[PDB]
Design a protein around this ligand. Structure first.
Ligand code: CLA
Ligand code: CLA
Ligand code: CLA
Ligand code: CLA
Ligand code: CLA
Ligand code: CLA
Ligand code: CLA
Ligand code: CLA
Ligand code: KC1
Ligand SMILES: CC1=C(/C=C/C(C)=C/C=C/C(C)=C/C=C/C=C(C)/C=C/C=C(C)/C=C/C2=C(C)CCCC2(C)C)C(C)(C)CCC1
Lengths: 168, 250, 165, 153, 160
């Protein structure tokens, strides 16, 4: 199921889950590299997003334009981008990192396969070979959860007008 | 293999859809699909359009063909075919997947009650829970009419006590004299009258039909039934009187 | 397990997980384990009706008891029990006493399945292989799992009512 | 084997068997885990503050109003500690010692030992139990401090 | 059954009401398990009244939220309404486990009073019957002592 990708296996009371109840993997097997790459990159950003909304509430960056109150998660976007602003500082940074991914897998991402997907090569904590399998599932399980978490955060916080960690 | 099922263009019908058709269609019908069967249209067209044949169609002809073929969703899958092939097997084997009527419909209870009785051709031996279950059998057998070891007068006495005790109520309440100071002796008299009337009917039955299932060996035919009916009359009197006594005292 | 195999594949969170985190079943004989289940199902079946009876009475539907007391009884089922006329309670006990007598002495359930108070075992199959039937084990799970939930649910209702209203 | 340590031997001036030691080992590890959770658990309402917040039952947006080492109560978070007590039982009745075939193994749900860093047996199994013993004395000593010698720090 | 740990000396097989003319062999152990459990509770119960009388009430707070210095709770009946229902629930829970532990089901090692305390395990010096019989005999004394103590605390009004 989905090549040798680690989304299933070590996945709860059952050893393997293999949740693909639309067949987006069997129907499009050439994109399992793309799907993993997207699934992982979604998880990492969502995890930074959720851990994002909380930390500005305590510390603020020394940019001295972000050093202002009332910049909650419903107005920080439309406020910083100016007539340019901090949001472009972040976007340029994300361009620098994303350009690195292009070099490793070629321009058309031809080198992207079902084993190198979502593997930028930053190996500091992991050890051994089975832990990498265990950590890869621990990555996704956290990542998939935060993707739904920040989804609930953004919708509930702006609908019910919470804008803070309880988001209720 | 079959000629027209080989090298059929995907444009005529897709591979998975064709396999689903072949699975749904019985094996004996592949060679010559009957008529009005999607496989019949597949044969009638794949023998006209293909690699060695007409490779093009008018847009309207292809449009009509695409509306004659299955759309990959109107065909039963393997599990559904298994459901049917096993449900029919159960039904023909004399076992019924037990279901219970509900709000215009029935819920399947997930139980296989063996349906045909010991005499499979007998219509009244089809065993059901309410008559052939363990509780139902033991309840019917333990009734006064059927209980083992009871003398006929005992069955009559028990049935009569039940009837006489019950029959007082409908008269002493909501009766013609329901609001009179007595209002219960009238009910007692009416209940005793009903008991006597049904006892007379039972005597008619025992002197005309003459059931012999309660007679002991070597006795006047129907004597057991007559004794049961007489003691039903006695028990009805007793039960009516006891109900009246309870009503008056309490 | 050996003897707990007679009540195997019928409990736990998932259907085939013998939970017993107290050893209450080990060293116990097959008949004792069957009798323990007969106690479990009987408690659960009453608990299911108890919870349903609690809710149809805590919402405002106590007709027999409003028409017998000639006044709307309190919605709180514990307090409505006191208001219910003593004739009603005694008849309620007697009816259950007749039912308990009826099941035990005249129409006893079997000794291999002491919970078959209706006695389906004489018309049931329970050992065939059909899919659109023979799911009797699954419906045994739904009875047990629902009943177990009802047992802790009704106790919660009584404990909370008798304490925090 | 296992929890036999280095500075002392079997330290049994009183079990001393196989089956009885196994049950005692389960108690030992179990008490070790709680103390380590409690010891680091007690230091946190200290520096980093009484971290909690958000909409809680009768404690909406409660900044962990259960103060002091004992926690007190007064419908402040300590009543919510009963929920900790209840859910602690759920793990104690699902992932428990009756199906815990070794001393106090819960099958390693987190798989931290599958090369993530911990290892099977050897020092790690000995380090867990030894650390638990230190924390159990530390938690008890911390209990004495809160009672009659002020607060933790 | 006439040769178990219960027959001490001052009375023989003391069954005046004839619970043993029909007492089945397992019924003895069941009733013995009842006797051992009753006696051990009574010993704990007795200590629980005579010890707070001479030794003062617990130096502490009992309930850190509802100001129970152990002194507002009297030693004896009526303390049931003074001790919190949760301190009552928590002792109920603790006693709840002590039986939902290693089982005391009929035939189990817990069904003859054996649970695994072994505070006094003499090296079989013909004293296993001594310690067993002493525990049963003291439990019988403790039960009688408690019921008198309960009547002492009730009929007089308080304590003794
Ligand atoms: C956009 C986010 C995203 C993406 C691209 C993927 C992508 C993938 N997931 Mg996945 N997943 C996600 C979110 C996502 N997931 C979330 C939020 C959960 C939690 C419910 C899961 C839970 C999950 C499980 C349990 C498993 C996967 C698996 C897979 C892989 C095969 C299934 C497939 O084709 O999915 C692609 C699906 C889409 C592109 C649909 C996107 C949403 C549509 C547009 C609505 C694939 C790499 C399987 C795997 O790795 O196989 C080994 C597997 O077993 N996922
Ligand atoms: C807007 C933000 C942003 C920034 C700061 C960069 C920065 C960079 N990109 Mg890049 N890029 C961007 C957006 C951005 N990119 C976008 C939107 C795409 C399309 C998805 C790409 C696709 C891309 C490719 C394909 C390549 C770069 C490359 C590069 C590097 C070449 C240096 C250079 O020419 O500097 C002036 C540099 C680090 C090159 C590189 O280093 O990769 C090997 C390269 O080959 N970029
Ligand atoms: C028209 C109504 C009616 C009828 C058809 C009968 C019919 C009968 N009664 Mg009867 N009975 C009735 C009203 C009636 N009873 C009433 C109102 C009373 C109350 C006074 C009695 C009191 C009564 C007694 C005390 C006895 C009968 C007996 C009998 C049976 C002879 C016969 C079945 C006798 C019987 O059952 O013996 C077998 C008998 O001993 N009846
Ligand atoms: C258990 C037996 C029993 C008892 C205790 C009573 C008791 C009583 N009967 Mg009674 N009665 C009985 C059997 C009994 N009856 C039977 C079997 C009959 C049918 C013949 C009657 C027919 C009967 C009549 C017709 C009347 C009584 C009446 C009375 C009351 C005087 C008294 C409460 C009298 C009464 O008080 O009525 C209001 C009355 O008029 N009884
Ligand atoms: C009348 C109560 C009762 C009885 C007799 C049984 C009987 C049985 N259950 Mg069971 N169960 C019950 C209630 C009951 N259950 C409830 C309410 C739940 C929900 C949590 C469960 C959940 C459950 C699971 C998940 C499983 C069983 C299983 C079993 C079988 C194995 C024997 C066993 O576990 O111990 C039998 C003996 C007892 C249960 C003793 C009763 C409890 C004692 C008296 C102490 C409890 C007191 C309690 C702490 C205080 C009361 C208030 C409380 C609500 C807070 C057996 C047939 C297993 C099985 O058959 O699976 C194959 C299994 O896996 N049960
Ligand atoms: C554990 C089972 C159980 C028990 C012990 C009781 C006990 C009681 N119910 Mg009750 N009840 C139950 C289940 C139960 N109920 C269920 C399942 C329902 C839903 C139909 C009800 C609906 C119900 C009503 C509507 C009323 C009671 C009332 C009462 C009280 C007076 C007796 C009476 O009239 O009952 C009558 C019970 C029924 C008519 C329900 C019959 C359904 C049976 C259980 C199907 C089998 C008594 C305390 C009366 C009262 O005043 O409450 C305080 C009352 O008015 N019950
Ligand atoms: C929970 C109480 C309890 C129980 C279950 C037992 C059980 C047993 N005892 Mg025992 N015993 C007890 C209390 C108890 N004892 C007390 C308090 C004493 C001290 C007087 C003794 C003294 C004693 C001796 C000397 C011997 C036994 C023996 C036995 C065993 C066989 C006799 C028998 O069947 O007794 C069954 C016991 C009962 C059924 C208890 C019923 C108690 C009734 C209902 C009330 C008695 C009056 C009571 C004090 C009234 C209190 C007043 C209150 C209402 C205000 C059996 C295991 C014999 C033995 O081991 O043989 C091998 C033996 O030799 N016991
Ligand atoms: C050996 C145990 C023992 C001891 C030392 C005492 C001691 C005492 N009892 Mg006593 N008593 C006991 C057992 C005991 N009781 C038992 C088992 C019962 C129940 C049969 C009683 C029933 C009892 C009553 C009814 C009374 C005493 C009273 C007294 C006091 C005089 C004295 C403090 C008297 C007292 O102080 O009032 C409670 C008193 O009137 N006792
Ligand atoms: C109501 C919404 C809902 C939620 C919120 C939810 C949540 C989770 N499900 Mg789930 N689920 C359904 C619905 C929901 N599931 C339904 C309708 C079915 C029947 C088809 C079903 C079945 C399975 C199976 C077979 C598995 C499973 C899993 C997990 C899992 C992972 C936890 C962990 O591994 O980190 C989490 C968080 C795996 C498992 O581990 O369960 C613990 C797995 O094997 N689920
Ligand atoms: C509603 C209900 C039901 C039903 C029920 C029923 C059906 C009942 C019936 C009941 C009845 C129906 C009862 C009856 C009873 C009776 C009695 C109790 C009687 C008694 C009698 C007597 C006692 C008599 C005596 C005598 C004689 C014998 C003769 C001489 C004189 C004298 C009087 C001595 C069901 C379950 C379905 C369900 C729901 C509920």
């Amino acid at each position: 199921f989905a090549g040798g990708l680690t989304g299933s296996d070590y996945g709860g009371f059952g050893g393997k889950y293999e949740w693909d109840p639309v067949g987006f993997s069997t129907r499009w097997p050439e994109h399992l590299a793309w799907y993993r790459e997207a699934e992982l990159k979604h998880g990492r950003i969502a995890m930074l997003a959720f851990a994002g909304l909380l930390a500005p509430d305590l510390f603020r960056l020394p940019w001295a334009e972000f050093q202002d109150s009332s910049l909650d998660f419903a107005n920080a976007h439309d406020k910083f981008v100016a007539g340019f602003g901090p949001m472009w500082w972040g976007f340029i940074a994300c361009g620098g990192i994303e350009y690195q991914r292009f070099r490793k897998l070629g321009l058309g991402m031809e080198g992207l396969t079902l084993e190198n997907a979502g593997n930028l090569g930053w190996f500091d904590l992991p050890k051994n070979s089975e832990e990498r399998l265990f950590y890869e599932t621990a990555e996704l399980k956290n990542g998939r959860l935060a993707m739904l978490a920040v989804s609930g955060i953004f919708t509930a916080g702006i609908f019910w007008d919470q804008h803070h960690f309880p988001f209720i | 293999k079959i000629a027209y099922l080989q090298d059929i263009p995907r444009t005529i019908v897709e591979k998975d859809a064709l396999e689903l058709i072949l699975k749904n269609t019985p094996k004996e019908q592949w060679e010559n699909p009957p008529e009005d069967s999607y496989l019949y249209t597949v044969k009638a067209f794949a023998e006209m359009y293909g690699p060695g044949k007409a490779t093009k169609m008018g847009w309207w002809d292809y449009y009509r063909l695409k509306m004659d073929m299955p759309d990959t969703t109107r065909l039963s899958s393997e599990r559904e075919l298994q459901e049917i092939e096993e449900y029919e097997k159960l039904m023909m084997s004399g076992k019924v997947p037990f279901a219970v009527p509900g709000p215009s419909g029935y819920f399947f209870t997930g139980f296989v009650t063996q349906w045909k009785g010991k005499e499979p051709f007998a219509g009244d031996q089809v065993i059901t829970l309410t008559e052939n279950g363990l509780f139902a059998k033991q309840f019917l057998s333990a009734l006064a009419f059927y209980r083992e070891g009871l003398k006929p007068w005992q069955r009559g006495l028990e049935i009569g006590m039940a009837h006489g005790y019950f029959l007082i109520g409908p008269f002493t309440s909501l009766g013609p004299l329901r609001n009179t100071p007595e209002a219960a002796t009238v009910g007692l008299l009416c209940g005793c009258a009903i008991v006597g009337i049904v006892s007379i009917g039972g005597l008619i039955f025992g002197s005309t039909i003459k059931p012999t299932r309660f007679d002991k060996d070597g006795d006047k035919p129907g004597a057991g039934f007559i004794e049961m009916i007489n003691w039903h009359a006695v028990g009805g009197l007793g039960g009516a009187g006891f109900a009246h006594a309870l009503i008056t005292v309490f | 397990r050996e003897a707990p195999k007679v009540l195997a594949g019928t409990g736990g969170p998932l259907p085939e997980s013998f939970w017993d985190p107290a050893g209450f079943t080990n060293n116990k004989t097959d008949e004792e384990l069957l009798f323990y289940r007969a106690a479990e199902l009987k408690h659960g079946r009453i608990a299911m009706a108890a919870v349903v009876g609690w809710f149809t009475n805590a919402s405002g539907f106590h007709y027999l008891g409003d028409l017998w007391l000639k006044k709307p009884a309190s919605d709180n089922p514990i307090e409505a029990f006191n208001q219910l006329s003593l004739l009603g309670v005694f008849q309620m006990v007697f009816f259950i006493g007749c039912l308990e007598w009826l099941t035990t002495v005249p129409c006893p359930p079997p000794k291999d399945a002491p919970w078959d108070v209706i006695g389906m075992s004489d018309v049931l199959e329970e050992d065939t292989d059909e899919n659109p039937m023979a799911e009797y084990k699954k419906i045994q799970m739904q009875e047990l799992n629902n009943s177990r939930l009802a047992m802790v649910a009704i106790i919660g209702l009584i404990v909370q009512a008798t304490t925090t209203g | 084997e296992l929890g036999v340590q280095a500075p002392v031997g079997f330290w049994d001036p009183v079990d001393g068997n196989v089956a009885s030691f196994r049950r005692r080992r389960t108690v030992e590890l179990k008490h070790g885990r709680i103390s380590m959770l409690a010891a680091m658990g007690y230091m946190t309402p200290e520096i980093t503050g009484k971290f909690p917040g958000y909409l809680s039952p009768s404690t909406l947006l409660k900044y962990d109003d259960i103060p002091n080492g004992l926690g007190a109560i007064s419908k402040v978070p300590a009543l919510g500690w009963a929920q900790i007590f209840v859910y602690c039982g759920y793990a104690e009745l699902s992932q428990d010692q009756t199906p815990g075939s070794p001393g106090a193994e819960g099958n390693f749900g987190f798989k931290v030992l599958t090369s993530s860093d911990p290892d099977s047996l050897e020092k790690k199994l000995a380090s867990e139990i030894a650390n638990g013993r230190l924390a159990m004395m530390a938690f008890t000593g911390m209990a004495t401090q809160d009672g009659l010698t002020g607060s933790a720090w």
